[PDB]
Structures are given as structure tokens and as C-alpha cells.
């Protein structure tokens, strides 16, 4: 969990 993933 990096809070930057392309979802």
C-alpha cells in the first residue's frame, strides 16, 4: 500500500 497505485 503506497497510495500511488494506478487503481
Amino acid at each position: 500500500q503506497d497510495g500511488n497505485e494506478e487503481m
Epitope: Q1, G3, E5, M7
Partner: antibody, heavy 116, light 112 residues
């Protein structure tokens, strides 16, 4: 590598909580740091985190009162929570939470009591 | 997302097998961003399993994890007194907003 929460303690209702998480032995710039709290005898509750980008995201219940900020030069992540009530009494943890990644590290927690 | 853990408590005898279920209300990230933590009183939670089934370093092999998407299971095969603790699943979801969610916990009492 380790993380450590600054001192909590006793707060009056309507006070603002400010906790610091200090990071050692790993790079804050590329690691997302969460704040998680646990009321006495209850379960873990994610508050929010600062992403590897430096921008923060929050649980919907926490968004209006909570600010999570990082200072990469000081190796710190700060949790500010306004408008405290007894419901905010808990142990507060900071953590690099590894749910789908190898790196995972949790602090020892600090006790926050909100009471008159 | 909601994370529903069942059962919320269980008493088990030494040597038994314990099964804990975690149901997410939507799929976790990449269908496998799901981890299991073990917490004893006064301690931070200790990660046991991440990415559904990967054992953390030094975790005994009697712990195994399975599942995908929204349904996950933690199995303790041959439970020991050292395993008496509360267990939490933890999932990650990126949409509509990045967030982590813990299950409500399962308190495991071990009968010696």
C-alpha cells in the same frame, strides 16, 4: 528499521491531538506511513496514511478532523486530530503497513486519553 | 470497504486446527492485498501472512493463508498456547480512495 510514536498522554475534550512518528533505518520518501488506533479492549482502526508521494488519505470518519503530514528531511510523520472526545481515547500506532509488500514495521503505540 | 471477520472468538484445544474467515465488501487491490496480523495484549500487531499466503519471516509453518478477491481464510494447523491472541485481517483498496481496512478481530483462546 523502526518507527516510534511521540508521547501521547491526557487531553481534555475539544483539545487537539498532535502525535509525531519518527522513522529510523528506512527511507520515508518511498514508504507510506499509516496511523492506526485501538480503543482499550477493542479492535484496530486505520485512521489514514501519507502516501509515498507525500499526499495523505483518510478513513471517511477521520477526514474532517485529521491531518497527516510528512517531513522527509526530519524523518517524521505527524498526526493532528482536532475536536477530541472521549471516543478518541485509544492507543495510537504509526506503521509502515505491508499488506501486499514485503516491508512492514509497526511502532510500540502511545496511549491517548481524552477525559475531563 | 467493509471487512467482516468470522468467528469473533473461538476456544480451541492444543493441536486443533483453527479456521478464520475474512470477507471484504469489495475486492482488495490486485485481488491479493490481504494480510493477517496476530496481536497479544499490550503489543503492536505482528504480521503473520501478507499477499494472501506469503509467510512473514520466522512465522511458524502451521500458519497458512488462502483466498482471493473478497474471501480469505487464515488456518492455524496444530494450534499451540503461544497462538492465544487476537487475529485481524487487513486489506487494501484503491478506489474510490486509497484506504486500508481491518477486520473486527478473532480472539483465540487456547485450551491447555
Amino acid at each position: 528499521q523502526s518507527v516510534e510514536e511521540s508521547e501521547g498522554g491526557l487531553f481534555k475534550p475539544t483539545d487537539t491531538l498532535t502525535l509525531t512518528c519518527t522513522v529510523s533505518g528506512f527511507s520515508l520518501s518511498s514508504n507510506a506511513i499509516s496511523w492506526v488506533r485501538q480503543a482499550p479492549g477493542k479492535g484496530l482502526e486505520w485512521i489514514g496514511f501519507v502516501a509515498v508521494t507525500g499526499y495523505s488519505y483518510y478513513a471517511s470518519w477521520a477526514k474532517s478532523r485529521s491531518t497527516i503530514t510528512r517531513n522527509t528531511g526530519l524523518n517524521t510523520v505527524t498526526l493532528k486530530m482536532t475536536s477530541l472526545t472521549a471516543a478518541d481515547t485509544a492507543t495510537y500506532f504509526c506503521a509502515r503497513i505491508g499488506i501486499g509488500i514485503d516491508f512492514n514495521i509497526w511502532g510500540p503505540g502511545t496511549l491517548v486519553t481524552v477525559s475531563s | 470497504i467493509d471487512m467482516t471477520q468470522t468467528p469473533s472468538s473461538k476456544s480451541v484445544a492444543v493441536g486443533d486446527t483453527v479456521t478464520i474467515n475474512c470477507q471484504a465488501s469489495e475486492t482488495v487491490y490486485k485481488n491479493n492485498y490481504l494480510a493477517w496480523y496476530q496481536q497479544k495484549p499490550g503489543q503492536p500487531p505482528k504480521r503473520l501472512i501478507y499477499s494472501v499466503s506469503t509467510l512473514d519471516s520466522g512465522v511458524p509453518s502451521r500458519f497458512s493463508g488462502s483466498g482471493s478477491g473478497t474471501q480469505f481464510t487464515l488456518t492455524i494447523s496444530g494450534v499451540q498456547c503461544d497462538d492465544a491472541a487476537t487475529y485481524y485481517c487487513a486489506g487494501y483498496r484503491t478506489t474510490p480512495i486509497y484506504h486500508i481496512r481491518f477486520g473486527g478481530g478473532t480472539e483465540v483462546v487456547v485450551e491447555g
